[PDB]
Design a protein around this ligand. Structure first.
Ligand SMILES: Nc1ncnc2c1ncn2[C@@H]1O[C@H](COP(=O)(O)OP(=O)(O)OP(=O)(O)O)[C@@H](O)[C@H]1O
Ligand SMILES: Nc1ncnc2c1ncn2[C@@H]1O[C@H](COP(=O)(O)OP(=O)(O)OP(=O)(O)O)[C@@H](O)[C@H]1O
Ligand SMILES: [Mg+2]
Ligand SMILES: [Mg+2]
Lengths: 379, 483
C-alpha cells in the first residue's frame, strides 16, 4: 500500500552527502573536517539551533556516507586516504557527565586489548598521544553542565573537553550540537521556511512511486507549520495525521490539512463554554471572579462566603450550601473555566489550603454576561 | 575498626552493573535476539487461598453489585486512531509516540489495553509481526529511574541497575539492527509521575522513538493535554509531537449505555429466590429484578455534569444497589452465612451522601465550651475584621461574654462549672475548664488553624472552614443566638 509507505516516510524516526535545504551548512561543517583531518590539527566545533532543524540528521548523514574499533577512511579535497575513528554519543543517555571520557575510550579501544580505567582529561590525553583522527559527535552538549553547583563547577566538563580538543600532540576533532582565542566555531542552524519544508518533503517522497498529496496541500502545511521557529517534526505529524484522518473516513486534498489543524488544536472558545452553563452556574462563576478580583489569593471558603453575602444583597435565587458550591466549582473546572489547586497560605498560619483561579479572558466573560441582561450587579 | 555510624538494615538487590554494549565483541557479534531464550519473555498466587467451610448467601442484588464493579461502547474514534497509528507503525517496522490525555476514569487505560489486545490478536494471525507489550506505570514505581530497570528487564531478561539499564536500552534502540529485533510497544501510564527535575527519563523515552532502528511504540497516557507545554522542555515537546488524543469526559447518554451494558443480562430478569436463606439463582419464589431507567438517567446526568467519570457512575449505581439490599436484608432478616426494584430514591440517597457536609452538624453537636470558643472567635472577626485572632483576645472576650450576660439563667448556672468545675476548693481559673481540650479538638477537626508560637496569648488562630457555615451552626444553638 502506498499509504503505509508514505506514513512510514513521515515519521520522526525515518532517515534519508548533503541533506535538502542544508547543503551550505553541510559544506561549512565539511570545511571543518576538510581542515581537521587534513593538517592533523585538533579543533572544536559548536552547533546550535531550535529543535527539528536537522543537526543530528545531517551529522548522522555525514557519518554514514563519507566515513581498534570504528576505523574507516576519509577523502580530503585532494583525497588520498586517511584513517579516521568516528563515533557518536548522546550526553543525556549517560549516567554521570564525568564518565564521558571513559565512554569515548569505550567507543575507541579494541575489546581484545586491556580495558583501562579513565577519570579525567589526563588519561584520555595520554591515550590519544601515540595516535589516525578521532571524530566525536556529542548530541545535547549542554546537559553536560551540572544543573546544581554554581558557575565555577557547572562548566567543568565542557571546558575540559574544549581544552582537550584544542591542545597539540593529539588529533581530537570535536563536534557538539546543542539546542537553542580557543572558543569553538559556531554555525547556527536556522528554522526552516515553507519552500525549504516543501523541497524536503518532495525529496523524501521522491522514493515513492506516486504522490498521494496535492502539492498545494504540502505548501499550505509547510506555510502553517513553519511560521517562526519552525520544526520539521511538526510538519511530519501534520502530514501523517492527514493520511490517518483520510483513511479513517474512507489524492489527499487541501481540506485534510485544515481537518488536522482543527482536530488537534483545542479551540478554547470561552463564549461557547459559557453558553453551555446554567444561569446559577454563571452566577457562581461571576461571584468567583469577583472574589479573585478583590482578594487576589482566595480560598474556596472565602469565595463561598463572598457568594453568600453577594447573593443575599440581591435577595433573588435563594442560596445553596458549601458542598454543592464546590460541586458547581467542579462543574466549572470540567467545563474549562476554573482551576482549583493546592497551595500554601501567606499568613501567620502557613498551612496548605485549596485555592481557586481562572484561565478565561475578561472581555468574552463580561460581554456574554452583559448579554444575559437580567442579573447585573455581579459583573 | 570503630565506626562513626552504622547502616545495619541495608537491603541491596542482585543487579549487575555491566551494560548490554559489552555483552558481545562487535555489532556483528550480536545474535538474533528473537531466537534467544531469555529475551522478550521466553508464584505468589496460592498463599491467599484457603478452604471454604460455609455457603455464602448471594442475595438478588449481589449479582448487580458484582456486575457494577470496575473489574467499548463509547470509545470508537479514540480506539480507531490509536489502533491505526499502532498498526501502521508496527507493520512497517517504525518507531512512534502516541499521546493520550484526559481526566480520571474516562477510559484511557481501558482503550489502550483493548488496542494492545486487538494488535496481539492480529499478530497471532500473522497479519503483523510479533511484538512485546510492556506496561510501565509511573505511580507504581518506588524510584522514577526504576522504569529503566523495568523496561530492560522486560526486553532482555537481565536485572541491571538503572544507569546500566539506561545505557543498555540506548545501545539496544540505537545500534541493534532491525533484522535481529522484535517490536516493543510501551505503555507509559501516569506520565506526569515520571517527570523529574532534570527530565532525563522523559527525554530518553521520547528520544528512543526517533531512532531509525528502535522499532519502539511509546503510548504515553497523561492527565492534561498541556503537560509538555507546562512541565517539559522544547526538545521533549518537539519529540512528542503535535498530534495529541483527548479523552473527553462521558456525556450522560454514554454513561447510560455503559451502565446498561453492565446490566444487559440482569435487568428485567427473573431469579429463583429461596425464602429460607435469601440465596438467589439467575435463570422458592420467582422475583423479577429491575433498576429504573429514570434512576440510571438521573445518576448519569449528575455524573456527566460533575466529571463524566465512569468509575463514579458505576460506584453511584453500586451504592444505590447496596442501600436497597441493606433495606431488603433488614426487612427479611436474611444474614450472610415479587418485584425487587432499586429505585430513584436509593440513587438520590447515594448522590446525597457524597454531597452532604458534616461540618455544620459536627459543630452543632459540640459541647458548650467549644461553641463558646467559636462564637467568641466570630465575635472578634466581627469587631476588627482581621480574620486571624490572638488566643488571649479570645480568652478576654469569652470572659467578657460571661460577665456581660451574667443575669441569664444558663450563664449563671454555667459560670461555676466554667471557672471552678463546680467546686469550692478549686480557685478561679484564668482559662475555662476544657480550654486546651476544645482548642486541640477544633485543631484536629480541621475547623481551626493555629500558628506555631510558644507564647499562648499572642498565638493567632484562624478559621479554616467558611465563616457563614460557622454562623449557621452558631445560630442553631439556643443559648448563643439569644445573647
Ligand atoms: N533536511 C532534512 N531532510 C530530511 N529529513 C530531515 C531534515 N531535517 C530534519 N529531518 C528529519 O527531522 C527529524 C529531526 O531532525 P534532527 O534530529 O536532526 O533535529 P535536531 O535539530 O537535532 O533537533 P533537536 O534539538 O530536537 O534534537 C528527523 O526525522 C530527521 O530525519
Ligand atoms: N467505555 C467504557 N465502557 C465500559 N466501562 C468503562 C468504560 N470507560 C471506563 N469504564 C470503566 O471505568 C474504569 C476506569 O477506566 P480507566 O481505568 O481506563 O480510566 P482512566 O482514564 O485510565 O483513569 P485514571 O486517570 O484514573 O487512571 C474501567 O476500568 C471500567 O470499569
Ligand atoms: Mg538532535
Ligand atoms: Mg488509567
Amino acid at each position: 500500500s502506498i499509504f503505509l509507505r508514505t506514513k512510514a516516510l513521515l515519521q520522526k524516526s525515518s532517515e534519508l552527502g548533503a541533506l535538502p535545504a542544508r547543503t551550505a551548512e553541510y559544506e561549512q561543517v565539511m570545511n571543518f573536517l576538510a581542515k581537521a583531518i587534513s593538517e592533523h590539527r585538533s579543533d572544536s566545533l559548536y552547533i546550535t539551533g531550535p529543535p527539528g532543524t536537522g543537526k543530528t540528521a545531517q551529522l548522522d548523514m555525514i557519518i554514514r556516507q563519507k566515513f581498534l574499533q570504528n576505523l574507516s577512511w576519509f577523502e580530503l579535497p585532494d583525497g588520498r586516504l586517511e584513517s579516521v575513528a568516528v563515533t557518536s554519543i548522546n550526553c543525556i543517555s549517560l549516567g554521570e557527565p564525568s564518565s564521558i571520557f571513559q565512554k569515548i575510550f569505550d567507543s575507541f579501544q579494541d575489546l581484545n586489548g586491556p580495558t583501562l580505567q579513565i577519570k579525567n582529561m589526563q588519561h584520555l590525553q595520554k591515550f590519544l598521544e601515540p595516535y589516525t583522527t578521532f571524530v566525536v559527535v556529542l548530541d545535547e552538549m549542554d546537559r553536560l553542565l551540572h544543573a546544581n553547583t554554581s558557575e565555577t563547577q557547572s562548566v567543568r566538563t565542557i571546558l575540559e573537553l574544549f581544552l582537550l580538543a584544542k591542545l597539540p600532540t593529539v588529533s581530537f576533532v570535536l563536534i557538539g550540537m546543542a539546542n537553542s582565542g580557543l572558543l569553538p566555531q559556531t554555525i547556527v542552524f536556522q528554522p526552516y521556511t515553507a519552500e525549504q519544508m516543501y523541497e524536503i518533503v518532495i525529496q523524501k517522497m521522491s522514493s515513492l512511486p506516486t504522490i498521494i498529496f496535492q502539492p498545494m496541500a504540502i505548501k499550505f502545511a509547510a506555510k502553517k507549520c513553519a511560521g517562526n521557529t519552525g520544526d520539521l517534526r511538526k510538519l511530519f505529524d501534520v502530514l501523517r495525521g492527514s493520511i490517518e484522518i483520510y483513511e479513517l473516513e474512507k489524492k489527499i486534498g487541501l481540506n485534510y490539512i485544515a481537518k488536522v489543524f482543527s482536530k488537534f488544536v483545542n479551540n478554547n472558545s470561552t463564549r461557547t463554554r459559557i453558553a453551555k452553563l446554567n444561569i446559577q452556574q454563571k452566577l457562581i462563576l461571576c461571584t468567583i471572579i469577583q472574589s479573585l478580583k478583590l482578594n487576589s489569593d482566595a480560598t474556596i471558603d472565602e469565595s463561598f462566603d463572598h457568594y453568600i453575602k453577594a447573593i443575599t444583597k440581591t435577595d433573588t435565587l435563594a442560596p445553596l450550601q458549601r458542598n454543592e458550591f464546590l460541586e458547581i466549582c467542579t462543574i466549572l473546572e470540567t467545563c474549562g473555566l476554573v482551576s482549583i489547586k493546592k497551595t500554601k497560605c501567606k499568613g501567620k498560619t502557613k498551612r496548605f489550603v485549596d485555592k481557586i483561579d481562572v484561565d478565561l479572558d475578561m472581555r468574552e466573560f463580561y460581554d456574554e454576561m452583559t448579554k444575559i441582561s437580567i442579573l447585573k450587579p455581579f459583573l | 575498626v570503630i565506626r562513626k555510624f552504622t547502616k545495619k538494615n541495608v537491603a541491596r538487590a542482585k543487579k549487575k552493573y555491566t551494560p548490554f554494549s559489552k555483552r558481545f565483541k562487535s555489532i556483528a557479534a550480536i545474535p538474533d535476539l528473537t531466537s534467544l531464550p531469555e529475551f522478550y519473555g521466553n508464584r505468589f498466587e496460592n498463599k491467599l487461598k484457603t478452604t471454604q467451610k460455609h455457603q455464602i448467601v448471594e442475595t438478588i442484588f449481589s449479582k448487580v453489585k458484582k456486575q457494577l464493579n470496575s473489574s467499548l461502547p463509547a470509545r470508537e474514534n479514540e480506539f480507531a486512531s490509536i489502533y491505526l497509528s499502532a498498526y501502521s507503525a508496527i507493520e512497517s517496522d517504525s518507531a512512534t509516540t502516541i499521546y493520550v490525555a484526559g481526566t480520571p476514569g474516562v477510559g484511557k487505560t481501558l482503550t489502550v489495553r483493548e488496542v494492545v489486545k486487538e494488535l496481539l490478536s492480529s499478530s497471532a494471525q500473522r497479519e503483523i509481526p510479533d511484538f512485546l507489550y510492556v506496561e510501565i506505570n509511573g505511580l507504581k514505581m518506588v524510584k522514577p529511574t526504576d522504569c529503566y530497570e523495568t523496561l530492560w528487564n522486560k526486553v532482555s531478561g537481565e536485572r541491571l541497575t538503572w544507569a546500566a539499564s539506561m545505557e543498555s536500552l540506548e545501545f539496544y534502540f540505537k545500534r541493534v539492527p532491525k533484522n535481529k529485533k522484535k517490536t516493543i510497544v510501551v505503555l507509559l501510564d501516569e506520565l506526569d509521575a515520571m517527570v523529574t527535575k532534570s527530565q532525563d527519563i522523559m527525554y530518553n523515552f521520547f528520544n528512543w522513538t526517533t531512532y531509525e532502528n528502535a522499532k519502539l511504540i511509546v503510548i504515553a497516557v497523561a492527565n492534561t493535554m498541556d503537560l509538555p507545554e507546562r512541565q517539559l522542555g522544547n526538545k521533549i515537546t518537539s519529540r512528542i509531537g503535535f498530534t495529541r488524543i483527548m479523552f473527553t469526559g462521558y456525556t450522560h447518554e454514554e454513561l447510560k449505555n455503559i451502565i446498561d451494558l453492565r446490566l444487559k443480562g440482569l435487568n428485567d430478569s427473573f431469579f429463583y429466590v429461596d425464602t429460607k436463606t435469601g440465596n438467589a439463582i439467575l435463570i422458592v419464589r420467582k422475583v423479577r429484578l429491575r433498576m429504573s431507567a429514570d434512576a440510571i438517567e438521573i445518576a448519569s446526568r449528575k455524573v456527566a455534569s460533575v466529571s463524566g467519570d465512569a468509575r463514579r457512575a458505576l460506584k453511584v449505581c453500586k451504592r444505590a444497589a447496596e442501600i436497597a439490599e441493606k433495606h431488603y436484608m433488614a426487612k427479611h432478616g436474611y444474614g450472610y452465612d415479587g418485584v425487587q426494584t432499586v429505585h430513584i430514591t436509593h440513587v438520590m440517597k447515594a448522590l446525597n451522601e457524597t454531597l452532604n457536609s458534616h461540618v455544620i452538624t459536627f459543630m452543632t453537636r459540640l459541647s458548650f465550651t467549644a461553641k463558646l470558643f467559636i462564637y467568641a472567635l466570630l465575635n472578634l472577626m466581627k469587631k476588627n475584621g482581621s480574620q486571624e485572632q490572638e488566643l488571649g483576645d479570645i480568652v478576654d472576650e469569652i470572659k467578657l461574654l460571661i460577665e456581660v450576660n451574667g443575669s441569664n439563667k444558663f450563664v449563671m448556672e454555667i459560670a461555676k462549672t466554667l471557672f471552678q468545675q463546680g467546686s469550692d476548693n478549686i480557685s478561679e481559673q484564668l482559662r475555662i475548664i476544657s480550654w486546651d481540650f476544645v482548642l486541640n479538638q477544633l485543631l484536629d477537626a480541621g475547623i481551626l488553624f493555629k500558628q506555631t508560637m510558644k507564647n499562648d496569648r499572642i498565638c493567632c488562630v484562624k478559621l479554616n472552614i467558611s465563616v457563614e457555615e460557622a454562623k449557621r451552626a452558631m445560630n442553631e444553638d439556643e443559648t448563643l443566638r439569644n445573647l
